[PDB]
């Protein structure tokens, strides 16, 4: 069979992964505005988000793109 380590168990095919955490759906999450983004899902605590931002939101993995982005 298979033992169920009490301490800490590794990932599982139970559910698909989205956020970099490489974990299943959990906690507060958001949807990346970028239509190209494959994940389009990240955890708040991870995306330094305290509340649900109104309008559009771009993950910290897309916005940081090498382009004409000047400031
Ligand atoms: Zn995460
Ligand atoms: Zn994104």
Curated annotation (Swiss-Prot):
Location in the cell: Nucleus
Superkingdom in the source lineage: Eukaryota
Zn finger intervals (PHD-type): 16-65
Tissue spec: Isoform 2, isoform 3, isoform 4 and isoform 5 are expressed in the mammary gland, ovary, spleen and muscle.
Site (described: Histone H3K4me3 binding): 18, 29, 33, 41
Binding positions (Zn(2+) 2): 32, 37, 59, 62
Family designation: Belongs to the ING family.
Domain notes per entry: The PHD-type zinc finger mediates the binding to H3K4me3.
Oligomer and partners: Homodimer. Component of the HBO1 complex composed of KAT7/HBO1, MEAF6, ING4 or ING5, and one scaffold subunit: complexes containing BRPF scaffold (BRPF1, BRD1/BRPF2 or BRPF3) direct KAT7/HBO1 specificity towards H3K14ac, while complexes containing JADE scaffold (JADE1, JADE2 and JADE3) mediate acetylation of histone H4. Interacts with H3K4me3 and to a lesser extent with H3K4me2, the interaction augments KAT7/HBO1 acetylation activity on H3 tails. Interacts with EP300, RELA and TP53; these interactions may be indirect. Interacts with EGLN1.
Record-given protein name: Inhibitor of growth protein 4
Native species: Mus musculus (Mouse)
């Amino acid at each position: 069979g298979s033992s169920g380590s009490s301490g800490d168990m590794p990932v599982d095919p139970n559910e698909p992964t989205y956020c970099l955490c490489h974990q299943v759906s959990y906690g507060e999450m958001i949807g990346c505005d970028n239509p190209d983004c494959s994940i389009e899902w990240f955890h708040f605590a991870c995306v330094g988000l305290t509340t649900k931002p109104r309008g559009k939101w771009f993950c910290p993995r897309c916005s940081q793109e090498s382009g004409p982005s000047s400031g």
